[PDB]
């Protein structure tokens, strides 16, 4: 070896697809009590593998993959009630730094404050 072009000396040894793993959408900012939400997840680059998704929160959120973007994977999920939802997506164990990501859901609170919705 002799990269020096990083991609290996980068630091986090690339960790693998952890770099091509892209995830950006509105469902990646907030959700509402029992309201269908979704976000995009582009991939198809590192190569075949697995994608584990550990969700945690006051309720079990649903998940729905939809290949309808010409290239971006649409993962539609559904939250049940406000709180701090946490998801961990890893492409073949390539857990992105964000994972565990955070998805604050709000019931007519758009914020669910520990003083308004008071928990």
């Amino acid at each position: 070896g002799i990269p020096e072009f990083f991609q290996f000396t980068v630091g986090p040894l690339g960790e693998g697809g952890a770099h091509k793993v892209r995830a950006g959408g509105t469902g990646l900012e907030r959700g509402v009590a029992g309201v269908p939400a979704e976000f995009s997840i582009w991939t198809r680059e590192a190569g075949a593998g697995g994608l584990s998704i550990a969700v945690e929160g006051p309720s079990k959120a649903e998940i729905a993959f939809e290949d309808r973007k010409d290239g971006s994977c649409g993962v539609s999920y559904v939250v049940q009630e406000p709180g701090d939802y946490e998801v961990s997506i890893k492409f073949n164990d390539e857990h992105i730094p964000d994972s565990p990501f955070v998805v604050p859901v709000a019931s007519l609170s758009d914020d669910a404050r520990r003083l308004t919705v008071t928990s």
Partner: peptide, 24 residues
């Protein structure tokens, strides 16, 4: 306060990308 219940509820599910037999 001290949330008596340990953390909130938990959930675990996922899938995997495994296209048909490679033949490209």
């Amino acid at each position: 306060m001290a949330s008596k219940p340990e953390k909130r509820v938990a959930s675990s599910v996922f899938i995997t990308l495994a296209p048909p037999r490679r033949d490209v």
